[PDB]
Design an enzyme around this catalytic site. Structure first.
Site, PDB file in Angstrom:
ATOM      1  N   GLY A 179     -27.894 111.319 -95.329  1.00 50.85           N
ATOM      2  CA  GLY A 179     -28.277 109.867 -95.053  1.00 50.85           C
ATOM      3  C   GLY A 179     -27.107 108.962 -95.120  1.00 50.85           C
ATOM      4  N   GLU A 180     -25.975 109.432 -96.102  1.00 56.23           N
ATOM      5  CA  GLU A 180     -25.047 108.395 -96.559  1.00 56.23           C
ATOM      6  C   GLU A 180     -25.294 107.157 -97.208  1.00 56.23           C
ATOM      7  OE1 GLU A 180     -24.492 108.243 -92.166  1.00 56.23           O
ATOM      8  OE2 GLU A 180     -25.994 109.491 -92.694  1.00 56.23           O
TER       9      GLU A 180
END
Length: 200
Positions: free
Chosen positions: A100-101
């Site tokens: 997802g970062e």
């Protein structure tokens, strides 16, 4: 030589995780070898004595209902009480992968400093500085050595962020040079790193 009862348990425990996560835990917690209620689950599940990385990860970095409590339980099992803020933000996102970062790290950070404060307690003012500062670095390193964020920030800029976010802490300048040095001199960070892929 006489294999101790405990030892025999530690072995069978690691085997469980190898077959499925949360199995080695239920064992110790079911046999009274561990303390449930997210008490000991932290000192063990968080890492353990050889627990499968893929397992501990699947449990840390998703959502669940009980897991969220295991993380909040104890936020000082990242072996960095005497290391440093930055140095902690360098190698502390592997062995699980954060899909997802930049999005979940935010919350995880609020609680990170909120409990990790024990490492110092008074050095970073209180806690707010420890948190707000932490991210400031996470971004530094990233933009520092990143293909999608080719920027290469400087130590000066950091101080520019510190001289205001601290809310009064100030933090020695010499410390900012050393804390940031751990990065420039020791790049690499969150998963998905180059890790020298050229290796043919």
């Amino acid at each position: 030589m006489k294999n101790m009862q405990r030892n025999k348990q530690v072995a069978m425990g690691r085997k469980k995780f190898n077959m499925d996560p949360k199995k080695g835990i239920q064992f110790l917690i079911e046999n009274d070898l561990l303390k449930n209620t997210c008490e000991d689950i932290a000192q063990f599940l968080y890492k353990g004595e050889g627990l499968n990385k893929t397992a501990i990860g699947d449990y840390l970095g998703e959502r669940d209902e009980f897991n969220i409590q295991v993380l909040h339980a104890f936020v000082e099992l990242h072996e960095f009480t005497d290391l440093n803020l930055v140095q902690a933000l360098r190698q502390f996102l592997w062995s699980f992968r954060l899909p997802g970062e930049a999005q979940k790290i935010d919350r995880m950070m609020e609680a990170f400093a909120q409990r990790y404060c024990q490492c110092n307690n008074g050095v970073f003012q209180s806690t707010d500085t420890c948190y707000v500062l932490s991210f400031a670095i996470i971004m530094l390193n990233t933009s520092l050595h990143n293909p999608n964020v080719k920027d290469k920030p400087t130590v000066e800029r950091f101080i520019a962020m510190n001289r205001g976010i601290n809310d009064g802490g100030d933090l020695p300048e010499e410390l900012l040079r050393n804390l940031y040095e751990s990065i420039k001199n020791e790049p690499f960070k969150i998963p998905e790193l180059e890790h020298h892929h050229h290796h043919h």
